[PDB]
Curated annotation (Swiss-Prot):
It is found in: Cytoplasm, Cytoskeleton; Cell junction; Cell membrane; Cytoplasm. Interacts (via FERM domain) with CADM1. Interacts (via FERM domain) with PRMT3; the interaction is direct and inhibits the protein-arginine N-methyltransferase activity of PRMT3. Interacts with PRMT5. Interacts with PRMT6. The chain holds residues 107 to 390 of 1087 of the full protein. The gene is EPB41L3. Signal peptide: none annotated. Expressed at high levels in brain, with lower levels in kidney, intestine, and testis. Detected in lung. This is Band 4.1-like protein 3. Residues 4-284 form the FERM domain. Disulfide bonds: none annotated. Tumor suppressor that inhibits cell proliferation and promotes apoptosis. Modulates the activity of protein arginine N-methyltransferases, including PRMT3 and PRMT5.
Amino acid sequence: PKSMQCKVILLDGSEYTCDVEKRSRGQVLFDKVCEHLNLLEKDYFGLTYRDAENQKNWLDPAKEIKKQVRSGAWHFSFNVKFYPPDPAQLSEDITRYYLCLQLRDDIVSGRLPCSFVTLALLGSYTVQSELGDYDPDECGSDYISEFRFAPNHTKELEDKVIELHKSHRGMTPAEAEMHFLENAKKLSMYGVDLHHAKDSEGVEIMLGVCASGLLIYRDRLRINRFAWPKVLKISYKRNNFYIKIRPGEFEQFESTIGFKLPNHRAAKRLWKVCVEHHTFFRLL
Ligand SMILES: Nc1ccc(S(=O)(=O)Nc2ccccn2)cc1
């Protein structure tokens, strides 16, 4: 029975290697990674891979791995797929831990923009969780942490992390991680998956997919929001993506809204992540 080697980049940046039978469905690999991670609250997570165009795709757990990675390497990343709106409602601390590690990468990468003060506060909770109480013996006036806190590090940010870290004496790791999450969950781009698109007039916009619905970023003024309940049908055709926007009270007709995506694969990808979010956050 022939088996393919899988390499998975974990959220701590380490590599997990395993073998699965070559006709295996994605769920097989995902189950092995989650067992390795001692993760029980698996519903919020998934594996990603890079397609022949180098775009991040979710590995569909119900489909054969080989029919998704196709010509590409069996290389994956473990990631948060559905960002819980209230991480305090998760049942296990280890779930909140992996969500923290993902968010730390969202921040360093710049996918999750963050004010100076929030970068420092999040950083201070990470340091408290990972090193425990502030120790002056490690931190002089010239201290720079090994922890990546931000897309661009400054001495001022390092100083503010230490100042806040001092305030957290006695805080346990689960407690610090919960504080991290109570702050992160409030950020306007928390758990927003962004897709480049054009509106029906060719004006470049961003579509964001998240727990609350679909977001349209036209300019810094005028951000449109479609709560999942207000969406009845998600569809794609060629390079186009469409949502059916339920009739408003006393309106005769549903309204259909149309976008142009970079190519057909990008329209299908956006359709699938929208359907999956609609399903997940209808049931939550
Ligand atoms: N994770 C997340 C991100 C953004 C938003 S929202 O504040 O824009 N609110 C809404 C409300 C309805 C439809 C779309 N966004 C909410 C949650």
